[PDB]
């Protein structure tokens, strides 16, 4: 497998073009893995088109100061209201794999999420992170010992939250058709994808929350009753996601699901939103709709493919800068102002 | 007429591609007959796009066991909540014609529907069925003797229900432009498509229900008042269908009609739903919307074209497996759970 | 020295609302308030009653020749009309023959008796009144697993054919039940378990997933939560979510044959009757309670004729007129 290895800054004008550019340097199989989604990708398209359902108004300013994109989540101050989503196998995009991603995220000044299915050996990731905050993403194992193992690993690696992914990564079914050091460290000699439950229950959430010693986000929530159940089971955060349309097909665009969840959560726990964030305007819309931060996924990996850590950094830089402009135009001085924006309801949808 | 004759399993990744693949092996005239629909096919397109109007939510599991797709209808246990729709002239797709279809359905473990316009001679069908359950589809003859004849035939052939099709198969009018052993057995020497009424009435339904000695499904229902009238006339089931858009043009997509019918039927009799089922997600949505089972039509015939009974079996296998995955993602352990799913209302339609 | 009525006689029931007032004349004040009252200032009890005006019946042409037949069946038991007796505590507040009187009325009429956890009659006394007729046992969730096991064993040995697990305590018992409780009861009962007090569709789905064999849509006659919807307003959403998985019993506010029809049209298999049967009991013992069941059956027959319905299944198929104006129209 010959992943790109060049490290360089890139002039990111938009994130959509990064996909096609990346397709030129990433081996076809790995590229398809990263870019593809369930079915005929109609729900991935829905993730993207959902942003046109609620539109931004320009508004007069009410404050004199320059815009400030910084925010805090779980008591940690970060440079802008976006974090890195947990994504498996960054080596499919770049030889520096998760270490490169971590470097970009740490240098930028936000939170790195580490997939249990990382191709890098934490020590490798740690060198990219250089002290930066990190959250650990897990799947629910059928074997309770394996959950104990990964929770221990996460605490040892200095994780400050656990991301409990609700859906099993068999991959999800598409119409079209490395090792895993972190888990192999604990599965070795056991002979145990199929090791995890296909879907978690409130009881699973309670088990993980009770034993992690850390706040647990439940990731993959798209229905408000699941958010309420998860919080009652002991979740410390709700991560609204459809995993970039990689799981359930003929489901809504993730952004359409956010307000009903935010209204039901009603401030009880922080909300992370993802699945389809491509522009600064999307970050603003998520915050206006109830998210505390958003997670970024595919665009960062395409950046990684194109320039290693500097290419990934350029993508985070693009989002921060684009968000600043959206703040100016919406009359927003800070991230809290964005949470107060009125959106225009577009009943016409994408074609207008 | 040179229909395909090869028997083989196929790797079914999606059912849409089976159409185009089939177009390569089926003679053009026969292929057009199977694939085509009324007008410019706008209502066939509507059948397909209707599935995007109600979207699936992923939901937390509430039960520990592996998903079980089995269900019961009319007291017969079947492997998954789908049956074979009555389709004329399977010989247009494959030399093993209805016998091949029957073999696939019987081996899979569901119900075979036999079209009155079968190209095979029941004895041929019977050898494929090998004891498997079968329902008999009839049209309402103008001549009452001919109805007596076919009802006798059905009872003799061990049918456990009658499917009374409400609309006469003159074909339906398109913008573009074998024998029938089962009916010829009774029409011989009579000199009698035009032998049947163009449309049935409640009085017809009552006549058939009174004399069949078997539960009668009325097939082609798209309006709730017709469902109520049919039940009052003695129907034992409602089969919601527009016959794969082969009859009335500039009518709604079949799935859009299902909830109003299900609400009016209100549990009185079982509901079979068809017209446009292409994915596991569609089976789930139909059940969530009030159907007890769905019927499969064109995809099975395309499978038949491509691999005889094994090709048709591969299609049923695809639906069963895809449904299992949808059950996992929706937190559903069984077919009853699917009937309880909440769907997301998408007011935007296909383009989102 | 509680002086409950003791006369046994048939009564000419023209409407059930007048039974409350008439009953107030013969039942001791304290007992009467207990029966007739509800939470808060009774706004939710009034909501139970006014909710029937939100969906209105249409007269319709007939499509069959035969006279109306009210018979139905639930859980394989054939009953005379689509209503059963709700579980109500302490019938001795209404009449000296207490639950034995009510049981006699229900069995003579030909429907199912529900026996409250707080019955004032002994089972032997009730058994005599039932004379073999079907009965369901209503229980609360005990905090002690062994007490639950004992109650479930007693019920099945007493010939119960279903258990009604009431989700809310009025009053050893849990105040509110959870899915786990439902599962524990369903797992050990050996009988279909109805979960009673459901008003929200998500609870119906959870209950069924936990092993309930029936959903009993109720707010216990507005006796529990105040400033909640009228029970009938909650029924369609629940019926749509249940989607035929298990039978639905509906109660809380049924007073007319039109209400029985509207409940069936909206997804209930049967309804349960409560206060009106007890007012009948106060007024005439088992014969007075019987007269109330007879009123509902005859009044439903008239409603069937007018709606063009020959049988209980036809009622399940009625279209209702949506009245967005509500009570004052
Ligand atoms: C290549 C790929 C691998 C992923 N692997 C995981 C995974 O290991 N665990 C997880 O919780 N989510 C995983 N995700 C989903 C992401 O965390 C995130 O929800 C998604 O990328 C956001 O959608 P977007 O990238 O289209 O904006 C993966 C996504 C992709 C693109
Ligand atoms: C080639 C063809 C022939 C058909 N012949 C009959 C028929 O004989 N009787 C009948 O009731 N329906 C007939 N149908 C309709 C099917 O029973 C069923 O309603 C339809 O195939 C479902 O639509 P779908 O196949 O697009 O999912 C036919 C459909 C097609 C494709
Ligand atoms: C006096 C009184 C006592 C009741 N006791 C019980 C009880 O023991 N257990 C129970 O599940 N419900 C109990 N209920 C509620 C009834 O089962 C039923 O839900 C209610 O009477 C129906 O409302 P309605 O009578 O106004 O039409 C009681 C209701 C009343 C009026």
Swiss-Prot record, chains A, B:
Cofactor binding note: Binds 1 FMN per subunit.
Xref: CDD domains: LOX_like_FMN (cd04737)
Q: Which PROSITE patterns match?
A: FMN_HYDROXY_ACID_DH_1, FMN_HYDROXY_ACID_DH_2
Q: Summarize the temperature dependence annotation.
A: Optimum temperature is 35 degrees Celsius.
**Where are the catalytic residues?**
243
**What residues does the FMN hydroxy acid dehydrogenase domain cover?**
7-348
Q: Which UniProt keywords apply?
A: Flavoprotein, FMN, Metal-binding, Nucleotide-binding, Oxidoreductase, Pyruvate
Biotech utility: Is widely used in biosensors to measure the lactate concentration in blood and other tissues.
Q: What else is known?
A: The proposed reaction pathway consists of two half-reactions, in which FMN is first reduced by L-lactate to become subsequently reoxidized by O2.
Report the NCBIfam families cross-referenced here: L_lactate_ox
Name of the protein in question = L-lactate oxidase
Curated annotation (Swiss-Prot), chain C:
- E.C. number, please? 1.1.3.-
Cofactor dependency: FMN
InterPro entries in alphabetical order: Aldolase_TIM, Alpha-hydoxy_acid_DH_FMN, FMN-dep_DH, FMN_HAD, FMN_hydac_DH_AS, L_lactate_ox
CDD domains assigned: LOX_like_FMN
Cite the binding residues for FMN. Answer: 87-89, 116, 138, 166, 196, 218, 251-255, 275
Binding note for cofactor? Binds 1 FMN per subunit.
Spell out the reaction equation it catalyses: (S)-lactate + O2 = pyruvate + H2O2
Keyword Nucleotide-binding in annotation: yes
Q: What region holds the FMN hydroxy acid dehydrogenase domain?
A: 8-325
The activity regulation comment is: L-lactate oxidation is competitively inhibited by glycolate, D-lactate, oxalate and 2-hydroxybutanoate.
Q: Which residues cross the membrane?
A: none
Protein family membership: Belongs to the FMN-dependent alpha-hydroxy acid dehydrogenase family.
Give the record's subunit note.
Homotetramer.
What protein name does the entry list? L-lactate oxidase
Q: Which organism is it from?
A: Aerococcus viridans (strain ATCC 11563 / DSM 20340 / CCUG 4311 / JCM 20461 / NBRC 12219 / NCTC 8251 / M1)
